[PDB]
Every structure is written in structure tokens, then in C-alpha cells.
Amino acid sequence: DVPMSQPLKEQEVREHQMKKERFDRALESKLLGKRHITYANSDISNKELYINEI
């Protein structure tokens, strides 16, 4: 019948957890992050089957 508010204990718990998470994310970013992204620059070859020209 009315637009009541969200829970209160849950709301404040979420606020505290968000503060902690923001702190941890800033700390990770300052440490160049623990996860990044890559592309492979080199491939294997075998001396039994070696190549130099076509």
C-alpha cells in the first residue's frame, strides 16, 4: 500500500561491506592489480623437425 524502505540492518551492513570492498579495490589497484590480460608473443618448435626457409 505504501513505498516502504529497504531493510535497515541489511542496508548498513551493505554500506560497511562496500567501504571495505572499495578499500580493498583501491589497495589492489595500487599494487598493479593481481589479475591482468595477455597475448602470446612466441610459439614452440622441435629440433627433430627444424626449419629455416621455404
Partner: protein
Amino acid sequence: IEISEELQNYTAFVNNLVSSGTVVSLKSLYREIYENIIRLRIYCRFTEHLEELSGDTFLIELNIFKSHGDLTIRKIATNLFNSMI
């Protein structure tokens, strides 16, 4: 010595086929020596640079080939690696 053992096994197998009198068409013969052609291909591609390599380099290459998915290539590499080791 492993190469020679393989060659002797192949000769024995080919002679058993021929004198067995159970090959009656070239298609049947080619069917019988399919895996032996594969084995000779392996034994002839592994030892192309035999005069240009050292035993430990062979050991490294055979360690790389012992993880091959093809059970035949892995068998052959395991035998060669075991002798050299």
C-alpha cells in the same frame, strides 16, 4: 641399436606376411603394413638430424615427444628415450 631392432622387427613382420600366404591383394597388403609404415615414418623423422645433434638434445626432444597424444609416437619416443637414458 634401437633403430636396428625396429628394422629387424619390420623385416620379420614383412616376411611373416609374405610367407604366410594370407595376403591376396595389394589393398590387403597395404592394410597390413599401415601401422608399420607409420612406425617407419616416425623412426625416419626422429633421426633426420642424427649426425648433427647430441644425445642430451635427443633426450630433450624425446621428452617433448613422450607426451604426444598419438599412442604410437609416444610408444616409440618412450622406447628411444629409455635406451638413451
